[PDB]
A paper describes a structure:
Methane-oxidizing bacteria play a central role in greenhouse gas mitigation and have potential applications in biomanufacturing. Their primary metabolic enzyme, particulate methane monooxygenase (pMMO), is housed in copper-induced intracytoplasmic membranes (ICMs), of which the function and biogenesis are not known.
To investigate pMMO in its native environment without the use of detergent, we conducted cryoET STA of pMMO embedded within isolated M. capsulatus (Bath) membranes. The cryoET STA structure of the pMMO trimer embedded in the ICM was determined to 4.8 Å resolution, and is consistent with the structure in native nanodiscs. The trimer architecture and folds of PmoA, PmoB, and PmoC resemble the previous crystal and cryoEM structures. These regions were fully modelled in the recent cryoEM structure of pMMO in native nanodiscs, which fits the cryoET STA map well. Several densities not accounted for by the pMMO model are also present and potentially correspond to lipids. CryoET of these membrane vesicles reveals that the ring-like particles are organized into an ordered hexagonal array. Analysis of the four distinct trimer interfaces contained within the system over a 100-ns simulation showed several interactions between the PmoB soluble domains of adjacent pMMO trimers, including a strong salt bridge interaction between K60 and E338 as well as more transient interactions involving residues K58/E160 and R167/D339. No direct protein interactions were observed within the transmembrane domains of PmoA, PmoB, or PmoC, suggesting that the inter-trimer contacts responsible for array formation are primarily mediated by the PmoB soluble domains.
Author numbering:
A (entry chain J): 7 to 191, 213 to 245
B (entry chain K), F (entry chain C): 45 to 282
C (entry chain I): 33 to 414
D (entry chain B): 150 to 191, 213 to 245
E (entry chain A): 157 to 207
G (entry chain E): 53 to 104
C-alpha cells in the first residue's frame, strides 16, 4: 500500500488537516451546547457582564472542556494547545451566531451582544501545563490563572460601557442604557472563581481520561 | 486514486442545504413564522416539518440500509493499499459528521437562542424549533450513524467488537432528543421562562459533552491507520 | 404574539389593561411613539404566578424595531424591575423611538417574576424610512456624547481579533510541525520529550509572560482613558405610586356565567345595583385584552386594535338606564370572533375555569364607573 | 420511550368517564373532583418528557441491576 | 354524631352537564375493573406463554 | 423423601397468623385504636407491642441459636442425595422469606398508607404502626436471617465465604428500621405531614430495592443445585 | 439616648430610641420577618439585662 516514506509524510499531513477539522468542529459543537445549556445568558448581554455573577460562573463553567481535552492532546500527543483550541471553538461558534443571527437575523447592536473574551486564560492553561508537565500543577496554578485573568482580560472591552450617564434623572452606565434601549423579552469574585476552577479542572481531568478510553464491546 | 474530492461533496452538501434554509427562514421568519395560529404557518412551516421527518426516516433507512448490506463480507484478506483508501473515506465521513454537528449544536442552537429573546413562543414548534430540533439534529445523528457503520463494515480493527467512544459519539446526539426537548418541558413548573441555567437544560449539556468522545474515536481511527500497514515509511524516516 | 397560546384564565385573571392609547399609528425612523394606559393587578392573582414582587415593564415587539427611550409607572422612570402590589391600579407610559422600517405589532407587557410574560393588547404600528438613518445619541456625565448604535464597536472587535489571533498564533506555531500520527506514535513506543525542546519552551513562556503583560498593560491603559466608571446600576424599585381610585358607585354580583363549547360567546347573569345618583348604563366588558361594547351605550375612539374591539359585541337583556337606588338582574352576552381567535375559548383546557374582567358603566352626562367582576365560568355542551 | 408514552393513553379508558363536566353547586368540577371532594381524606408534552426521562432511568437502572445480579462471596 | 341505618342504603347521585345522572358510589366501577382485569390477564398470558 | 409439605407450614403459618391479626385490628381499629390516650389502648394495643418485641428477641435467639449449633460440622463428605433434600428445604426457607416480605413490605405497608389518610395520628405507635413496623418487619427479617444461616450451615457452596447478594437481601430488611422510621421522623421540620414523596421516605425506597438482591441469591441457589450433582440427567436429556 | 457615658462595673446603662424600617427596603435583604434586637459591642463587655 504505502509506496515511499515521502508519500507517507503526505498522508499524515492530509490527515492532520482533516482530523483537526473534526476535532475542532466537534469541539465547537459540543462545547457551545455546554456554555448554552449551563448558563442564564450573561454572555448574550453587555448589561449582564457584572462584577459578581459573570466574573464567578463564567471561568468555572468553562474550564471543563479545556481541562478534559488538555488531558488527552498533551498526554497522548504532547500537543499543548488543548485549552486554546476549545476556547477558539466556542468563540468562533458564538461570533458567527452573534453576527449573522443576533445582529443579522434580529437586529441587536454588536456593541451590545458581543461575547466574553476567553483566550488569555486558555494560554495560561496551555502553557502552564506544557512547562512543568504536571497536571496537578496545572489544576492548581493553571486553573488559578484561568480564573483570575478572566475579568481583567475583558476589562478593555467592557470599560467603555461603564461610563456614568444621568439618564432621565437616574444614574445608569452605558451598558444599562443599552439593555434598556434595545428591547429583549468584587474581585473576591475572581478569587472564588479561581479557587473553584481548580476542583473543576481537577474533576474534568479524570472525566477526560474516560473520553480518551479506547475499548471495544460485544 | 487515494482520497478524492468526494469530500468536497461532504462540505458543500450541508453548506448549500443549510444556507438555503437560513435564506428560507430569513424571508419567512417574519411573514408566517410570527403568528403560528395563521394558516400561512400550517403551510410554509408545519408542512415543512412533516416533510422533513418523513425524509429523514427514509434517507436514514436508505443510508444505513445501503451500507449495512454492502458490508464487506470478505474483509479477512484485502490489501493495505485499500485499507488506506477506505480509512481516508472513513475520515471524510467524520468530517461530514463534525460539519453536521457544527450546524446543529453551534449554529442553529444559539440561533434559537436569539429567537427566544425576540419573540414569546406560540408553540413548541417555532420556525427555529422546526429547524433546530427536527431538521438539524436528525441530520447530524444520521451522519453520525453512517460514519460509525462505515467504519464497522469497511475497516478491520473497527470491525472487531464495538468502539465505546464511537458508540458514545453517535448515541449522545440521539439521546439529546428529550435532553434538548426538556429545555421547554422542564422549565414550566418552577419557572416556565426559558432560562438556559435551569436544571431542565442540564441534559443538553451532558449529551453535548458526549461529543468529546470524538477524541477517543480519532485515537482509535489513527490506530486503525497504523495497524493497516501505514505509519512506518516517513514515520521512521523522520 | 405569544398570548393566545398561553392559558386563557391566566390571561383573564392576571393583569387588566385599560385606557390604552397610542400617539401614532405610522412613524418615521428616529421618530417617537408614546404608549399610555393603566393596569390593575387582579386581586385573585393565580397561584402559579409568583406575586409581582419583582416585575418589569417591558415592550412586546420583534426585537429592537423600536428602542425604549423611556418608561414610566406612576410618575417614576422605571429602568429597573419594580414591585407592583396585588389589587392596585397604576398608570404607565412607554416611549419608543423607531429603528427598523416595517409593520410591527407592539404590545405592552409585564415581566412578572416567577413564571410568565404577561402580554397586554398588541397594536400594529408602521415604521417608514431607512435603518441607516437611526441614531441613538447619549451624553455622559463625562463630557462626551456618543451613539449607542455603534459606541465602542471597534474597540470590542479589536480586542477580540487580537486575542483570537494570538490563540491562532499559538496553535499555528505548533502546527508548522506535523500534528497527529507521528507525534502519537513517538509517545507510544519509547518516550515523547523529543517532541518538545528549548526552542519550544522559550516560546511557551514567551507567550505566558507576553499574555499576563498585555492583559495588565491593557487594563491600566483602559483605566487611563475612561478613569470615571460606575458599576451596572441594578435592583428592584420599591414604592411604586399606585393610582387613587374613587370607590365605585355601582356594585355587581355574578350569578352563574357560562360559555358554549364550540362557540364565540360567554353569557353571564349579573345583578347590577346602582348606588350613587345618576341613571347608569353598561357600556363595556373587558376580559382578556378583548373589549366587548354596547354601541347603543359606548363607542371607542382610541383606535383600540381592530381584532380585539367588538364594536357591538356586548348585549344586555335590558340596557335601559338603571335609576339610582334601583337594582336589577340582567342577562349579558359577550360575543365576538375574538373569543375564538384569541382562544379565550381555550379555557376548556385550563385547570381553573374562572374568569375575571372589568365592567364599565356610564351615566347620562358620560362619566364612568369601573367595577371588576370575577366568578367561575362553566361550560355548556348540550 | 414506549413505556413512557403509552402510559396515559393506557389509562384513558379507565379515567375518561371520571372527567365528565358537572356544575356542582355553581362551580365547574369533573366527576373525579367531586369524588375527592365528597369522600373525605385528611399536557402530552408531559408524556414525552416522561419518555425522554425513562430513558436515563432505564439506563441507570440497567447497570444497578448488574450489581444485584452479582455472584461474589466474602470473608 | 351518630348514624343509624344500613350502608347499603347510601346513594350519592350526581347529574352531569352531559345529561346523565349517576351514582358516585359505584359510577364507572365495572369499567375500572374490566380494563384492569383485561390488561392483567394479558400480562399473565405473556408470562404464561413462556412458562 | 425429597421435599415435603413442611412447606405447607411455611405458607399457612404466616397466612393464619396475619389473618388473625387483620381480624384483630379489624375489630379494635375502631374501639381502643382511635384515641391512644384512652386506657383501652394501653391494654389492647400497647401491651400488644411489648409482647411482640419480647417474643421476637426470644424466637430470633432460639431460631438462629438452634440452626447455628445444629450447623453440619462434617459437611466435607455428605451425599448429593441429601445435597438435594437440603437444597430444597433451603428453597422452602426462601419461600417463607418472600411470603414474609409480601406481608411486611406490601400488605401492612400500603395498609398503614390508608390508615394515615383516615385518621390524624396520636402517636408514632398507631395500631398499624404496632403491626407494620414492630411486628411485620421483625418477622420477615427473622425469616430472612434464618434462611441465610440455613444455607451457610447446611449447604456447601454457600458454606464457602459470604454471599454478597444474600447478605444484602437479609441486611436490607434490618436497615429499614430507621429507614422506614424516618418516614415520620424526617417529615416534621419542612413538612410534618406524611408526604410519601418527602426525602424522609427515600431510605425506605433504597432499602426496599435491596430486595432485588433475591435475583443474585436465586442465581447462586441454582448454581448450588448444579454443583450438588444435579442438572445433568434431564438437562442433557432435553 | 444613652443614660451614661462612664460607668462602674455592675452598674446599668440604658439605651433608648426609635427606629423606622424603610419602606423601600432593599431586595437583597430578607424582609425582617425574623429580626433580633441586638447590641453592637466587643463581646460581653456588658451583659444585656433587658431589651424592649
Amino acid at each position: 500500500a504505502v509506496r515511499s516514506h515521502a508519500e507517507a509524510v503526505q498522508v499524515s499531513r492530509t490527515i492532520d488537516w482533516m482530523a483537526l477539522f473534526v476535532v475542532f468542529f466537534v469541539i465547537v459543537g459540543s462545547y457551545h451546547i455546554h456554555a448554552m445549556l449551563t448558563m442564564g445568558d450573561w454572555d448574550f448581554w453587555s448589561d449582564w457582564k457584572d462584577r459578581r455573577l459573570w466574573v464567578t460562573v463564567t471561568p468555572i463553567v468553562l474550564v471543563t472542556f479545556p481541562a478534559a481535552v488538555q488531558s488527552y492532546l498533551w498526554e497522548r500527543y504532547r500537543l499543548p494547545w488543548g485549552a486554546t483550541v476549545c476556547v477558539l471553538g466556542l468563540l468562533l461558534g458564538e461570533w458567527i451566531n452573534r453576527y449573522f443571527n443576533f445582529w443579522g437575523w434580529t437586529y441587536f447592536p454588536i456593541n451590545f451582544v458581543f461575547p466574553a473574551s476567553l483566550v488569555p486564560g486558555a494560554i495560561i492553561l496551555d502553557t502552564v501545563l506544557m512547562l512543568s508537565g504536571s497536571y496537578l500543577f496545572t489544576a492548581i496554578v493553571g486553573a488559578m490563572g484561568w480564573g483570575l485573568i478572566f475579568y481583567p482580560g475583558n476589562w478593555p472591552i467592557i470599560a467603555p460601557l461603564h461610563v456614568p450617564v444621568e439618564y432621565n434623572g437616574m444614574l445608569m452606565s452605558i451598558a444599562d442604557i443599552q439593555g434598556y434601549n434595545y428591547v429583549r423579552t468584587a474581585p473576591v469574585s475572581a478569587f472564588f472563581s479561581a479557587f473553584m476552577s481548580i476542583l473543576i479542572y481537577f474533576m474534568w481531568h479524570f472525566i477526560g481520561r474516560w473520553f480518551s478510553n479506547e475499548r471495544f464491546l460485544q | 486514486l487515494l482520497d478524492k474530492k468526494w469530500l468536497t461533496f461532504a462540505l458543500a452538501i450541508y453548506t448549500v442545504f443549510y444556507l438555503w434554509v437560513r435564506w428560507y427562514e430569513g424571508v419567512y421568519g417574519w411573514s408566517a413564522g410570527l403568528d403560528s395560529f395563521a394558516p400561512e404557518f400550517e403551510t410554509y412551516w408545519m408542512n415543512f416539518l412533516y416533510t422533513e421527518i418523513v425524509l429523514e426516516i427514509v434517507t436514514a433507512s436508505i443510508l444505513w440500509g445501503y451500507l449495512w448490506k454492502t458490508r464487506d463480507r470478505n474483509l479477512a484478506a484485502l490489501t493495505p493499499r485499500e485499507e488506506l483508501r477506505r480509512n481516508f473515506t472513513h475520515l471524510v465521513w467524520l468530517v461530514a459528521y463534525a460539519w453536521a454537528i457544527y450546524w446543529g449544536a453551534s449554529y442553529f442552537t444559539e440561533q434559537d437562542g436569539t429567537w427566544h429573546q425576540t419573540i414569546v413562543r406560540d408553540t413548541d414548534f417555532t420556525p427555529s424549533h422546526i429547524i433546530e430540533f427536527y431538521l438539524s439534529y436528525p441530520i447530524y445523528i444520521i451522519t453520525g450513524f453512517a460514519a460509525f457503520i462505515y467504519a464497522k463494515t469497511r475497516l478491520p480493527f473497527f470491525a472487531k467488537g464495538i468502539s465505546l467512544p464511537y458508540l458514545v459519539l453517535v448515541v449522545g446526539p440521539f439521546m439529546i432528543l428529550p435532553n434538548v426537548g426538556l429545555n421547554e418541558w422542564g422549565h414550566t413548573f418552577w419557572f416556565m421562562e426559558e432560562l438556559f441555567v435551569a436544571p431542565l437544560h442540564y441534559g443538553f449539556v451532558i449529551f453535548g459533552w458526549l461529543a468529546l468522545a470524538v477524541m477517543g474515536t480519532l485515537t482509535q481511527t489513527f490506530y486503525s491507520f497504523a495497524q493497516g500497514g501505514l505509519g512506518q515509511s516517513l514515520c521512521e524516516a523522520v | 404574539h405569544g398570548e393566545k397560546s398561553q392559558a386563557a384564565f391566566m390571561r383573564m385573571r392576571t393583569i387588566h389593561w385599560y385606557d390604552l392609547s397610542w400617539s401614532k399609528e405610522k412613524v418615521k425612523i428616529n421618530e417617537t411613539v408614546e404608549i399610555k394606559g393603566k393596569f390593575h393587578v387582579f386581586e385573585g392573582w393565580p397561584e402559579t404566578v409568583d406575586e409581582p414582587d419583582v416585575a418589569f415593564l417591558n415592550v412586546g415587539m420583534p426585537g429592537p424595531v423600536f428602542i425604549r427611550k423611556e418608561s414610566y409607572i406612576g410618575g417614576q422612570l422605571v429602568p429597573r424591575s419594580v414591585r407592583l402590589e396585588i389589587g392596585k391600579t397604576y398608570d404607565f407610559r412607554v416611549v419608543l423611538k423607531a429603528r427598523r422600517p416595517g409593520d410591527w405589532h407592539v404590545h405592552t407587557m409585564m415581566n412578572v417574576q416567577g413564571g410568565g410574560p404577561i402580554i397586554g393588547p398588541g397594536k400594529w404600528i408602521t415604521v417608514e424610512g431607512s435603518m441607516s438613518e437611526f441614531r441613538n445619541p447619549v451624553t455622559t456625565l463625562t463630557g462626551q456624547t456618543v451613539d449607542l448604535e455603534n459606541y465602542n464597536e471597534g474597540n470590542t472587535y479589536f480586542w477580540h481579533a487580537f486575542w483570537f489571533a494570538i490563540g491562532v498564533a499559538w496553535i499555528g506555531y505548533w502546527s508548522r510541525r506535523p500534528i497527529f500520527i507521528p507525534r502519537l506514535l513517538m509517545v507510544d513506543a519509547g518516550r515523547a520529550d523529543e517532541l518538545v525542546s528549548a526552542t519550544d519552551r522559550k516560546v511557551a513562556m514567551g507567550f505566558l509572560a507576553a499574555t499576563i503583560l498585555i492583559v495588565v498593560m491593557a487594563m491600566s491603559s483602559a483605566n487611563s482613558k475612561y478613569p470615571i466608571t460606575i458599576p451596572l446600576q441594578a435592583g428592584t424599585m420599591r414604592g411604586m405610586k399606585p393610582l387613587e381610585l374613587p370607590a365605585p358607585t355601582v356594585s355587581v354580583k355574578v350569578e352563574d356565567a357560562t360559555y358554549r363549547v364550540p362557540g364565540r360567546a360567554m353569557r353571564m347573569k349579573l345583578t347590577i345595583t346602582n348606588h350613587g345618583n345618576s341613571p347608569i348604563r353598561l357600556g363595556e366588558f373587558y376580559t382578556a385584552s378583548v373589549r366587548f361594547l354596547d354601541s347603543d351605550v359606548y363607542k371607542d375612539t382610541t383606535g383600540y386594535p381592530e381584532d380585539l374591539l367588538a364594536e357591538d359585541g356586548l348585549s344586555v337583556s335590558d340596557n335601559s338606564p338603571l335609576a339610582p337606588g334601583e337594582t336589577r338582574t340582567v342577562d349579558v352576552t359577550a360575543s365576538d370572533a375574538a373569543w375564538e381567535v384569541y382562544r379565550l375559548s381555550d379555557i376548556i383546557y385550563d385547570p381553573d375555569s374562572r374568569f375575571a374582567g372589568l365592567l364599565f358603566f356610564f351615566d347620562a352626562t358620560g362619566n364612568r364607573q369601573v367595577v371588576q367582576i370575577d366568578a367561575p365560568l362553566i361550560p355548556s355542551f348540550m
